[PDB]
Design a protein around this ligand. Sequence first.
Ligand code: NDP
Ligand code: NDP
Ligand code: VIL
Ligand code: VIL
Ligand code: VIL
Ligand code: VIL
Lengths: 208, 201
Amino acid sequence: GSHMMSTRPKISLIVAALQPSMGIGAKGSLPWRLKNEMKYFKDVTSKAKDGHINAVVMGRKTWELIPERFRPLAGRLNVILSRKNDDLIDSNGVYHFSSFDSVMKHLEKDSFRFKDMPLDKIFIIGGSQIYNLLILDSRVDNLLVTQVHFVGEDADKPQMDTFLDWDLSKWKRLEHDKLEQYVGLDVPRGLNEEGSYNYEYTMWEKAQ
Amino acid sequence: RPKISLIVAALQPSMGIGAKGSLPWRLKNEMKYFKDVTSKAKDGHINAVVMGRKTWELIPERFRPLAGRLNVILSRKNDDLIDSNGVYHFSSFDSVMKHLEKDSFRFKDMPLDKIFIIGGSQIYNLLILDSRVDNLLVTQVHFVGEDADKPQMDTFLDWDLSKWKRLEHDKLEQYVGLDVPRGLNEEGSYNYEYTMWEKAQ
Ligand SMILES: NC(=O)C1=CN([C@@H]2O[C@H](COP(=O)(O)OP(=O)(O)OC[C@H]3O[C@@H](n4cnc5c(N)ncnc54)[C@H](OP(=O)(O)O)[C@@H]3O)[C@@H](O)[C@H]2O)C=CC1
Ligand SMILES: NC(=O)C1=CN([C@@H]2O[C@H](COP(=O)(O)OP(=O)(O)OC[C@H]3O[C@@H](n4cnc5c(N)ncnc54)[C@H](OP(=O)(O)O)[C@@H]3O)[C@@H](O)[C@H]2O)C=CC1
Ligand SMILES: CC1(C)NC(N)=NC(N)N1c1ccc(Cl)cc1
Ligand SMILES: CC1(C)NC(N)=NC(N)N1c1ccc(Cl)cc1
Ligand SMILES: CC1(C)NC(N)=NC(N)N1c1ccc(Cl)cc1
Ligand SMILES: CC1(C)NC(N)=NC(N)N1c1ccc(Cl)cc1
């Protein structure tokens, strides 16, 4: 049909955000190490329909936070955004593009395929500048937000300096079963506990 | 330099903007859009609002200056001074732009993000010919009541829109920095739509 079509991959913003501030960063890096949350990130961004592959799209600084031994993130099309990029694909298969608009156009011309595999989902994986722009892009279909809560001792609280500029009243939180349907995986329900943190996996779609 | 916008709400197709020193309609959500847009700035930045002397006088004194924004008022009779509240009383757009630039486009150590020209008709009709204006933010207002109740207006834009081109909605949102309703909004006997325009070239 013409409503909620399938002519391009769905686009998700996926982030882990500290409540209530939507804090995401401290001194240029991630303020917590949540082992199972990072497993969820890998599992979700890698899970694709048979014979498909997903993309991960990120700002240049977030790319630079990934240890070199991890690059490019395995099993996914990696796209890096930098204003001076030349919209080229390098010898490692990494896409270096100058805007989200430019990479979306290039993928469409290639039939949303990457090395003879169709794309399933496109995930925007950070960082702050990219999230603050793309929350306004009408093409974004949903948010995958891990809501992170610090429950430890006051001395151990994370010292945050970077926050999402997102208006969640423009979005609506979905039922857990809808999250599972979208990501293609069984997902823990409710609060998960690790160390000094609790966290919950959530999915949001546009309001109204 | 900061980008410069003319921001206006105008009745279609006459481009009427006022009647007897007030707006011809009472649209609470449209006024909130104006407030949200003109106040939305990058962290540590501030926006300016530039207006003619007569529109300044229409703001109730208790609400002057418009909070959270650098207020500039144009009157041929101003001495180019900054008052105790930080209000810029300037004699021309020229003079205030040259002063802001000599200050590195900063106000109290905050860089200017955007400069908004907020009316009224005399300022709009002059400044739409100023090469420094980058875009128009036009709320297109439509009267949708009965013919017997159609509004009277006394003040109008004189704009040649053939010199401008309307942008897609996502470009409006990116510029103003906010998620903005698309298409026609309804309040009472009026519908209205938020639009953005750049120079046609
Ligand atoms: N889930 C979480 O909690 C996450 C948190 N983060 C946090 O985010 C922070 C880093 O965010 P940030 O510093 O904003 O860096 P980003 O990862 O957003 O990369 C910023 C760079 O992206 C490029 N860029 C920005 N806007 C555009 C554009 N419109 N078009 C093209 N390229 C663009 C520029 O690269 P150039 O300068 O080369 O032009 C800019 O310097 C860190 O604290 C990190 O920990 C990161 C990911 C997820
Ligand atoms: N719908 C909308 O979006 C808006 C509607 N309005 C409506 O517009 C009407 C008011 O508009 P208008 O009557 O045109 O008044 P303006 O707000 O344009 O103020 C006109 C005054 O601006 C000063 N001025 C004009 N040209 C110059 C210049 N070249 N250099 C310096 N100063 C200058 C003069 O002040 P002096 O005489 O002191 O020199 C002049 O009297 C009202 O009905 C109001 O409600 C107002 C704003 C927006
Ligand atoms: C925080 C984490 C691990 N979890 C999550 N839910 N969303 C995102 N984007 N995440 C992330 C992924 C890759 C990079 Cl390089 C930086 C941060
Ligand atoms: C690659 C990812 C998500 N997966 C993993 N297993 N370990 C780490 N450190 N990871 C990471 C996390 C945050 C940032 Cl900012 C950059 C890379
Ligand atoms: C009409 C309104 C509220 N909405 C809009 N879109 N543009 C402008 N300039 N507006 C306005 C703002 C302040 C003043 Cl004092 C007079 C009119
Ligand atoms: C600027 C604004 C919205 N803010 C406020 N607090 N009160 C009033 N009257 N305002 C107003 C509305 C229309 C016109 Cl023509 C002039 C000023």
